[PDB]
A paper describes a structure:
We then determined structures of STEAP4EM in the presence of NADPH and FAD (cofactor-bound state) and in the presence of NADP+, FAD, and Fe3+-NTA (cofactor/substrate-bound state) using single-particle cryo-EM. The cofactor and cofactor/substrate-bound datasets yielded reconstructed density maps at 3.8 and 3.1 Å resolution, respectively. Binding of substrate Fe3+-NTA does not induce conformational rearrangements in STEAP4, because the densities of the cofactor/substrate and the cofactor-bound structures are virtually identical. Nevertheless, a prominent and highly significant density, positioned directly above the porphyrin in each protomer, is observed in a difference map between the two reconstructions. STEAP4 residues are positioned far beyond ~2.0-Å from the center of the difference density, indicating no direct interactions of Fe3+ with residues of enzyme. Instead, we observed nine basic amino acids surrounding the difference density at 4.5–9 Å distances. These residues form a positively charged, ~16-Å wide ring that is consistent with binding of Fe3+, while it remains in complex with a negatively charged chelator like NTA or citrate. We propose that this ring-shaped arrangement of basic amino-acid residues provides a second coordination shell, which may facilitate metal reduction by controlling the position of chelated Fe3+ with respect to the heme, and by modulating the polarity of the iron-chelator complex, thereby making Fe3+ more susceptible to electron uptake. Although the current data does not allow to accurately model the substrate in the density, it is obvious that binding of iron(III), by itself, in this electropositive environment is highly unfavorable. This implies that STEAPs reduce iron while it remains in complex with a negatively charged chelator.
Numbering used by the authors:
A (entry chain C), B (entry chain A), C (entry chain B): 19 to 454
Write the structure that this text describes.
């Protein structure tokens, strides 16, 4: 039966130690005081640091980085042992090297393996290990690394091997972050949903209060967020396919592809997935606010008054078939534009993305990605055809609030249309392999 | 070229043997009667048990557990061989030890590897291996276990290593179950959709038949299941976040977190995912029944009569703006409450759940999980404001059937609000690390 | 520090070489002209072919298959080296053996490992490696194959081991295909959406133009694709469960299950997933076109005229409760039939499909798959009950265009109902294990 020593009897020391007694391991704890040990599992004795290290070959140090000082006092006991470093830091970039690098320079005669820092101490105890299922294992000694990965499999976890000990810097960065790539689409969308809220409140509830004095302030429940949410979804969709256009222009002037993107475009290349899925989250709200139009009281009342007024005044509507074209056209373009929008979101799942090679992925994400941005722009051009862009449409001196949201998507489609023409695109094909 | 012996020429023996002839293996079957062999592949000879075992090093026993008796008669031939045990049982907990444990005690001088019990014999033959793609491999000998995993890769399958031979008890439990965790949310929801069907039939089709005698029995097609399905979705959502409240209370009285939950709460901790996804399945039905309201005949007729009666009787509706607030408010709260409801369901996918550490998962599942249960409770409080809870709302002595569904969600939100206050929550922070 | 030689300084040679300088490898390029080397990374010298191969043990040949001729001129240098073959072909089935097989016959004294052909040269450079994350590694020498997989882990990629070198034929087929299994459901659906477009244009816009001359040509925006898309979704759903019925008939005549399906049924067995997900894509369009009915101008106008005409002509509608049954029945059957339709699509995800054994998968995909095809057929039978199949329903001599779409689903449900009866099904149970 295997023996696993655990330095430190703290929170994660008890939780990892009690998980190993349930899987058939003889755990020998090591603490500063083996005399007074109140909370400990049943079949696990507690010894000194030098005494417990003489019993196993795998030593898990469940201590913080600041108290790594005593390991130099017993470096002749730790010769040939497997020291599993599990520690995290309180914040990113607190120390220059990682902990497993620093633990290797303290005890040079021992094989250091980074593991177990992703999982939490409560997930081992309660058994509610759902996102803390994978354990990232990295180390230099390949024989010692396969032995630690056998413990992770016997504890019901899934070891993901991360290579050599150089990858321990990124593993300690992993449990500290809270959506690091989603920060720029959240901040861009929040400053675009606040500006476009104050832009529609000034048009729809303030302008009918100054002129033609009426309350009209219920609009900011559904009727104003059904203008914020599609225009935010259309703008953020156009901000997705804009770096691929700016980078295509920036390669034509340079004449080569082997130079580096200018450090603001490169960070905005990597947030396209994050900008795309936030734009799907707002387009999905625009669908739900639109499909619930005929349930609202204002829509039932307005269609109720318009029918009664037509009933007592014997004038009639002669069914203009031109307006039946437009109202069935922009609704149809919005449905095809949302079907492909969802289809880009299905492919964004990390299991669907791995069952797809880079040609099938480029066909969905780029060929059917502009075709989303064409249909979602034609959905709001044909909707703009009913309003005609007349001078009776701007309230003070500021227009109908969707034509501001057509500046970025119609800019992307014009510049992309230049890059499709063979006087330019045949140069791009010769530049994706190398050119002067 | 490799040689793989297969004991037993039955259903899975032919299916696994014919799959290995298509991948470049020389398969030697072993049966009780090598003389009469009718159904067999082409390039695979059939020998005796002792004769076929002298030709390979990997022996796959395609026999049941009851006929393991003959292997003790030839235990001197099986020395050093790799015996791959593939057997299942007819029911869970039929024998005390697993089959691979029992196969190791019969032949102690052989390395036993559990594999191939997850896949079916038809999925190897027809090639329709879709859920039977992963093959769970476990065994003590690490050199013999990597050799069996090389066969699984060459057969187009994906070996998932499960550790030592102690994990063979759970692998044999795997192909027998049929949604074992989903049993409690299915039985709770079925006894809550049956009671709430008879509660709405008594109010909506029986009470208009006794008093004011009219048929009114078409309601149980859409109009009654649009009352069952949201209240079942709201109750099951409140039953998700109720164990996290009961466990928080039960840690304050104990003063420590290291004691065990009382065996009914612990089984209801593990079914939160299962209760949550069933509650999303009923909320998704409540969306589809609601968005199809203006297509129904009863809604078109009632809005048709109410307009014609207002047309021939010249009284008018003066557009009460107060009721335009409420009807745009509970509809908006239902959309935000369903958007985050879906967002919890996207994170529940086992590929999205693994691309997310436990802080980003706790932010979605708990911070944005109560915020779902707040918005979905405020969606049905504001809907209850239109009905005012007047005494003309209860039919015999029993109320309007959604206020029964507000008992559990408003209980969770009150007790959670006590646990947020810093006179209690600062004790919870000191108790998630250890306290007296 | 490790040394990795790369033959060939081309497009993928620079991209893979610059990725390895960023991970702590000393890369030594090999080219035909080490004198003139313009584009190259900083810390990577360029030598001759025989000179650079004498410095490392891992040699990555970044050259095409046609220029493999020079490796026979230096086969005494490549003894014991690990030659990583990364090449692709311009088209499928261009050469009889794969490249890694052909590279092994050129240099017999070297271990050949196929890797890196899935990823692209731009994904290494730009860092936008999203679908080119997995690297398929296969080779005969297990010690050399684990060494190449350590490079793939250190480059931030994920090595998927594919077994021996026999699997290199399928890995070179992998980056060339563009949805190979989706071709038959795309071509079947396109020839069924074109025929059913011309069938509804002849009924709905040509027949009201010849008789009772009116424009009526706006129908082909929403109103005609809301007839194409559900009938295509219902037909393709019936074409899913039809091979399982034809194969069940074809096993009863044969009397055994061990014979081979006749090569058109076998290719249509494998496209059931592909036919099923395309049928979900059209049913999801039928939902979105249907839920947007009360927003269209034609529906608002027609319900506006029908109310005003009822307001000025004092006749009334007495609320036939029979038509309130039917219109709430087929709408309810369409919602239950679409809920299970989506539930089959959630299980089709390759992460949900792997978290499910073959009994839970057969319960969803087959037991709840016919129950989808029953409810979606009863959704269009009850919708056909409102139209009664009168002789005033066919326009010239051709019927109401959904009853053509009931031929295939009602054929499958009748023949499946024969196979459920125990005079037939007890023979199928005795034939799924072997019978004469
Ligand atoms: C809902 C949604 C989900 C999304 N999910 C994802 C996701 O999961 N992952 C993701 O990455 N994006 C995602 N996106 C973003 C979008 O799909 C990407 O932009 C897409 O992958 C490529 O778009 P592109 O037009 O910029 O093409 P790109 O190829 O990225 O950009 C074109 C330019 O890139 C350069 N380039 C491209 N290929 C090469 C080459 N072989 N050699 C040299 N230069 C080259 C050239 O300069 C070319 O002009 C998503 C978007 C949405 C709306
Ligand atoms: C649609 C949907 C999908 C869902 N999917 C999932 C899913 O995939 N997986 C899943 O697990 N749940 C899932 N849930 C359930 C829900 O998300 C969980 O309850 C959530 O993970 C945590 O909720 P909670 O408030 O109970 O928090 P919890 O943290 O589970 O409960 C709080 C209590 O737990 C204890 N506790 C928590 N953390 C610690 C700690 N570090 N140390 C000590 N004690 C601690 C304390 O007693 C604390 O008061 C889903 C729910 C829905 C509605
Ligand atoms: C939205 C959607 C998604 C889908 N996704 C998938 C998917 O991911 N993967 C997929 O495979 N299909 C998928 N399908 C197709 C459908 O689910 C399959 O047909 C289903 O897996 C089985 O259906 P079946 O009735 O043909 O059953 P089958 O079992 O495939 O066919 C029955 C016949 O198969 C033979 N047979 C079955 N089991 C055995 C056995 N043990 N021994 C001998 N003979 C046997 C017998 O002849 C039997 O009569 C999908 C369909 C839809 C609509
Ligand atoms: N959820 C988690 O707790 C979690 C999760 C992931 C990773 N980790 C990591 O696991 C390790 C355990 O930390 P923890 O959170 O569980 O807290 P902790 O173990 O309770 O406190 C740190 C441990 O250091 C030991 N130690 C030895 N000398 C010490 C000294 N001079 N001063 C203070 N302590 C000394 C202590 O045990 P003795 O005095 O008895 O010897 C003490 O148990 C940490 O590195 C942590 O980053 C924890
Ligand atoms: N879909 C599947 O079939 C499937 C799936 C997963 C796992 N398995 C497992 O694979 C194994 C094969 O079982 P099976 O379903 O395919 O049925 P089976 O093989 O047809 O019957 C059991 C086999 O035991 C052999 N055997 C040897 N001595 C025997 C004896 N005294 N009495 C009876 N049989 C004897 C028989 O072959 P000979 O008499 O010719 O030697 C017979 O082929 C089982 O353990 C099963 O749990 C099967
Ligand atoms: N996106 C990709 O580029 C990609 C992706 C996956 C796989 N691959 C594979 O990686 C390999 C590299 O090809 P590549 O696309 O990057 O084009 P390439 O390397 O620019 O051209 C082929 C290479 O062959 C070398 N070579 C040696 N003798 C040659 C000769 N007589 N004639 C022509 N070339 C000779 C050349 O380098 P020197 O003359 O300087 O020695 C040249 O760099 C290919 O096998 C490719 O299938 C490429
Ligand atoms: C289910 C599919 C969709 C339907 C039925 C739909 C329908 C509509 C309708 C009816 C309007 C007019 C709103 C009103 O009456 O005030 C509208 C506006 C709009 N839609 Fe959509 N839409 C859909 C999807 C999309 C998508 C995917 C986008 C792109 C992100 C989009 C962008 C817009 C924009 C920009 C407006 C104008 C916003 C305004 O100024 O009011 N829609 N949509
Ligand atoms: C798309 C989003 C949603 C919309 C538009 C919506 C709309 C509505 C409407 C209009 C009603 C009144 C039904 C009627 O007219 O008889 C209602 C009732 C209700 N909704 Fe929602 N809802 C949504 C999502 C949700 C969610 C996510 C929940 C929580 C599970 C929920 C819980 C309820 C409850 C409990 C009722 C009262 C049931 C009754 O007694 O009739 N809804 N909803
Ligand atoms: C959200 C769920 C669904 C709803 C509310 C729904 C509703 C309807 C409605 C109202 C119609 C009549 C269309 C019209 O007024 O012209 C219809 C037609 C039809 N539906 Fe559905 N449906 C649903 C899902 C499905 C599904 C999943 C299928 C099967 C693929 C299906 C198959 C059909 C067929 C075949 C027709 C007849 C097409 C025609 O001739 O017009 N539906 N549906
Ligand atoms: C508050 C927003 C939280 C959203 C969390 C989330 O969904 O992202 C988790 C992860 C994304 O994480 P990273 O790509 O690693 O940033 O999974 C997905 O790819 C999303 C696919 C979803 C496709 C439908
Ligand atoms: C009759 C109900 C059958 C449902 C089957 C199912 O969906 O669960 C399969 C599995 C769940 O299986 P377990 O978590 O292992 O119980 O995948 C999911 O996590 C669901 C995610 C779904 C998120 C949208
Ligand atoms: C133009 C159509 C492109 C569609 C691409 C696609 O979705 O398939 C990618 C892959 C399917 O690829 P293969 O099964 O390998 O053919 O993932 C899925 O299983 C789909 C699950 C989706 C379940 C919702
Ligand atoms: C209603 O429609 C009919 C034909 O569809 C038309 O003749 C009649 O004038 C309309 N009634 C109105 C517009 O009041
Ligand atoms: C219809 O609305 C107008 C203003 O919107 C109002 O003046 C008129 O009284 C309404 N007609 C009714 C209530 O019949
Ligand atoms: C409207 O409905 C009432 C009862 O709901 C009925 O008595 C009345 O006749 C209807 N008005 C019509 C049909 O014009």
């Amino acid at each position: 039966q295997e023996t696993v020593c655990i330095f430190g009897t703290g929170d994660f020391g008890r939780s990892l130690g009690l998980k190993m007694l349930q899987c058939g391991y003889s755990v020998v704890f090591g603490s500063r005081n083996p005399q007074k040990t109140t909370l400990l599992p049943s079949g696990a004795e507690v010894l000194s640091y030098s005494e417990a290290a003489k019993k196993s070959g795998i030593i898990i140090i469940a201590i913080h980085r600041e108290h790594y000082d005593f390991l130099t006092e017993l470096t002749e006991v730790l010769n040939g042992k497997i020291l599993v470093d599990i520690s995290n830091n309180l914040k990113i970039n607190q120390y220059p090297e990682s902990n497993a690098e620093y633990l290797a320079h303290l005890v040079p005669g021992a094989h250091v393996v980074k593991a177990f820092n992703t999982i939490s101490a409560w997930a081992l105890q309660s058994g509610a290990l759902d996102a803390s299922r994978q354990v990232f294992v990295c180390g230099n000694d390949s024989k010692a690394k396969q032995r630690v990965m056998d413990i992770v499999r016997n504890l019901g976890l899934t070891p993901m091997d991360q290579g050599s000990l150089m990858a321990a810097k990124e593993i300690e960065k992993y449990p500290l972050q809270l959506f690091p790539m989603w920060r720029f689409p959240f901040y861009l969308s929040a400053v675009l949903c606040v500006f476009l809220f104050f832009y529609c409140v000034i048009r729809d509830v303030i302008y009918p209060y100054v002129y033609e004095k009426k309350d009209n302030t219920f609009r900011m429940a559904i009727s104003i967020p059904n203008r914020i949410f599609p225009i935010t979804a259309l703008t953020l969709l156009a901000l997705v396919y804009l770096p691929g256009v700016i980078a295509a222009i920036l390669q034509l002037y340079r004449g080569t592809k082997y130079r580096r993107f200018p450090d603001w475009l490169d960070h905005w290349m990597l947030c396209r997935k994050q900008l795309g899925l936030v734009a799907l989250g707002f387009a999905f709200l625009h669908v739900l606010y639109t499909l619930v139009i005929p349930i609202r009281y204002y829509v039932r009342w307005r269609l109720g008054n318009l029918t009664v007024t037509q009933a007592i005044l014997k004038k009639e509507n002669p069914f203009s078939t031109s307006s039946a074209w437009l109202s069935d056209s922009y609704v149809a373009l919005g449905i095809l534009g949302f079907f492909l929008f969802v289809l880009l979101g299905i492919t964004s799942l990390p299991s669907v993305s791995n069952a797809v090679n880079w040609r099938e992925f480029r066909f969905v994400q780029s060929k059917l990605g502009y075709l989303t941005l064409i249909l979602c722009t034609a959905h709001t051009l044909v909707y703009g055809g009913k309003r005609f862009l007349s001078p009776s449409n701007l309230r003070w001196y500021l227009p109908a609030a969707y034509v501001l949201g057509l500046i970025i998507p119609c800019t992307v489609l014009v510049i992309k249309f230049v890059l499709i023409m063979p006087c330019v695109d045949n140069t791009l094909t010769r530049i994706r392999q190398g050119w002067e």
